[PDB]
Amino acid sequence: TLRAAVFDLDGVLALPAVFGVLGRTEEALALPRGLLNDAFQKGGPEGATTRLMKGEITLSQWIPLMEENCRKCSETAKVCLPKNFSIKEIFDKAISARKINRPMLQAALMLRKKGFTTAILTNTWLDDRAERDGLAQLMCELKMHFDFLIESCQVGMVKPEPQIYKFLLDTLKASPSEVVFLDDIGANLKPARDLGMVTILVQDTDTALKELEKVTGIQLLNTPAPLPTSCNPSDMSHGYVTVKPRVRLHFVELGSGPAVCLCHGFPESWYSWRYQIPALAQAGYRVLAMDMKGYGESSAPPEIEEYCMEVLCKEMVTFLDKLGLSQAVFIGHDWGGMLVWYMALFYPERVRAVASLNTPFIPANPNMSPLESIKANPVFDYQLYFQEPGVAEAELEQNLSRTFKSLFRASDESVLSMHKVCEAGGLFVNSPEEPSLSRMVTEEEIQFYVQQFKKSGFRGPLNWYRNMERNWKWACKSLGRKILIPALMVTAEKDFVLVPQMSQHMEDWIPHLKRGHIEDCGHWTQMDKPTEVNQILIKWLDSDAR
């Protein structure tokens, strides 16, 4: 019975195979057939290429040896190499052109999802070329999805030597009959076959996957679109900054490039961005996913005034100051969306660009108290219930699992009416004791929120709602301003609290505003429609935030 799948890199997980470029160059340069592939393999197990693949020498050391091999091969075949013939240029282009074979990676991901141990086994080199980063990036993206990466140049062994296969079985902690081995080179496939591993010769990806699903008994071809890569909290880099004596802010950090600060809503976590973090880092951004003040590993002081927008924003500026960041792109959802608009209004020099999911920017009405303004919208009744300190904390902290299961639901699964909450006397009074699990979340993901909320509870989070008057007076100081920095507003069709119509006047205060819209998407945007969120945010970042 199979329980391990091994994939080659070249011609299997990555295409076009860097191998085929020697034949392509021959044909494009009208050189005798096989001339370059012959110079590439000159000396066999004793030649320059084997020394390279075993890690004896680096790629830059191999380049002049291959050039000398090309010369001897052309001499014997009675031909001439062209004037600006560069092995460096040929391979720079070939490596750069090689991209991940997405359907092959999707199959490896599915097999691992079904409890398979997956590995990459590859004949590769120590790359010290000026342009080595492209390949480093490719290897980084691929490897995170596998249990093991076995590189010939690191192990001092190459395919087809039989020792590398015994090394493979040893790392897999598996007998050969439990292993599928996928390779594009029949000669590299033979020793695995000789040992009794299931083997697949890969030419076209489609046929290889048909062979793979037949042999594993798992659907891999024509399968639905998978969810974006998520985060394992224990595998992340965790950052901590003290912004003032009693207040520290925790964040999760991934990627390189322009700093992107993700600001969650109520009652959430940095983890609400789990589907965005790998995708934005992959897009070329340095992601800083916050635990906002009052949440997770960030400090949660008990004082209401500690959660007014003026202080929350001041601390976010101090956070940038301590990290040595002159700016960050600020992306917020829900209450985090409200914060990001104030960052843009009060600290434009610190905000590279601003984006909000669901939360519209609405200027303060100087002729009405925020209490009157809340009363005007029946959907905002739960906000009045959240006012009295200790009341909502008691209900929300009673059964943590019930709280998150009841809140985190798609538009077609609702358990919660947020209208006539004060009248009913609670958020969950007409809600079941043991709610069903929403399609948007796993049981494990719910338990992560439960564990995060065990530290500080709901006091700090609820305190965000308890500064209406304070926030209103502060926001009135910005009434003569406009947001003129790059800005994106993303509306969610089925968010019944933060409705798309509520954002209709934004153009008056943000004239250059760009928009995104997600159909059949409820309040919990990031987990409801993660693929669409990632597409909208990356397109906007690349065009407007660099």
Ligand X SMILES: COc1ccc(C)cc1S(=O)(=O)NCC1(c2ccccc2)CCN(C(=O)NCc2ccc(C)cc2)CC1
Do the annotations mark residue 184 as ligand-binding?
yes
Options 264, 465, 495, 544, the catalytic residue: 465
Start-end of H helices in 376-442? 382-385, 391-398, 400-407, 421-424
Nearer to ligand X, 109 or 362 (CB): 362
For its own copies, the binding residue among 45, 75, 79, 128 (CB under 8 A) is 128
CA atoms of 293 and 307, how far apart (whole Å):
8
Q: Does 455 bind its own copies (CB under 8 A)?
A: no
Is position 542 annotated in a ligand binding site? no
- Contacting residue, 191, 255, 337, 530, with its own copies by CB under 8 A: 255
Which position among 334, 381, 528, 544 bears the catalytic label?
Answer: 334
- Mapping DSSP to helix (H, G, I), strand (E, B) and coil, where does residue 172 land? helix
- Rank residues 237 and 367 by Cβ distance to its own copies and give the closer one: 237
Q: Which residue(s) pair with 215 in the sheet? A: none
Per DSSP bridges, beta strands 99-100 and 328-333 are unpaired
Q: Binding its own copies by CB under 8 A: which of 35, 121, 126, 416?
A: 126
Is residue 520 a known part of a binding site? Answer: no
Shortest Cβ 230–its own copies spacing (Å)? 14
Nearer to ligand X, 55 or 360 (CB): 360
Q: Which two tokens stand for residue 444?
A: 């494990």
Q: Per the omega criterion (within 30 degrees of 0), is the bond before 258 cis? A: no
Task: Give residues 393-422 in contact with ligand X (rule: CB under 6 A).
Answer: 407
Span near its own copies by CB under 8 A; candidates 372-380, 456-464, 476-484, 497-505:
476-484
**Strand runs (DSSP E) across 405-474, as ranges?**
none
**Binds ligand X (CB under 6 A): choice among 215, 374, 384, 499:** 374
What are the C-alpha distances in Å from 419 to residues 267, 377, 412, 422?
A: 18, 9, 18, 8
Catalytic residue list contains 240: no
| Window 227-266: contact mask with ligand X (x via CB under 6 A) | --------------------------------------xx
The string of DSSP letters for 526-546 reads HHHSHHHHHHHHHHHHHHHT-
Binding mask 316-335 for ligand X (x = CB under 6 A): ------------------xx
333 flagged as catalytic: no
Determine if residue 10 is labeled as part of a ligand binding site: yes
Point out which span in 57-65, 68-76, 222-230, 356-364 binds ligand X (CB under 6 A): 356-364
Establish if 546 lies at the interface with its own copies (CB under 8 A): no
Backbone φ, ψ for residue 241 (5° rounding): -130, 130
Phi, psi (deg, nearest 5) at residue 254: -150, 135
Work out whether 485 is an interface residue with its own copies (CB under 8 A).
yes
Tell me: does residue 61 bind its own copies (CB under 8 A): yes
Residue 526, φ and ψ in degrees, nearest 5? -60, -40
What is the smallest separation between the CB atom of 127 and its own copies, expressed in angstroms?
Answer: 5
120 binds, among ligand X, its own copies, none (CB under 5 to 8 A by kind): none
Place of tokens 């691992």: 112
Q: Residue 67: how many CB atoms within 10 A of its CB?
A: 15
Query: In angstroms, what CA-CA distances link 262 with 80, 241, 251, 342, 539?
Result: 59, 16, 9, 15, 16
| Interface region with its own copies, contact rule CB under 8 A, candidates 68-76, 123-131, 181-189, 404-412 | 123-131
Tokens 């009060």 correspond to what residue? 346
| Tokens read off for 363 | 């200027």
| Three-state helix/strand/coil letters over 456-500 | HCCHHHHHCCCCHHHHHHHHHCCCCCCCCCCEEEEEECCCCCCCH
Q: How far apart are CA 22 and CA 381, in angstroms?
A: 70
Is residue 383 involved in binding ligand X (CB under 6 A)? yes
Choose among 138, 135, 131, 132: nearest CA to 102: 138
Q: Is 238 a catalytic residue?
A: no
Alpha carbons 430 and 382: distance in angstroms, whole number: 14
Q: With CA atoms as reference, report the closest residue to 434 among 425, 445, 426, 443.
A: 443
For the chain, the maximum distance between any two Cα atoms, rounded to a whole number of angstroms, is: 95
Map the footprint of its own copies across residues 130-169, applying CB under 8 A.
Answer: 132-133, 135-137, 139-140, 143-144, 154, 156
Question: Which residues within the stretch 512-541 sit at the binding site for ligand X (CB under 6 A)?
Answer: 523
Positions in the binding site for ligand X (CB under 6 A) = 265-266, 334-335, 338, 359-360, 362, 373-374, 377, 380, 383, 407, 468, 497, 502, 523
Positions in the binding site for its own copies (CB under 8 A) = 51, 55-58, 60-61, 126-128, 132-133, 135-137, 139-140, 143-144, 154, 156, 234-242, 253-256, 259, 281, 286-287, 321-327, 346, 348-350, 352, 477, 480-485
- Tell me the catalytic residues: 334, 465, 523
Question: Could you tell me which residues are annotated as the binding site for phosphate?
Answer: 122-123
Question: Could you tell me which residues are annotated as the binding site?
Answer: 8, 10, 122-123, 184, 382
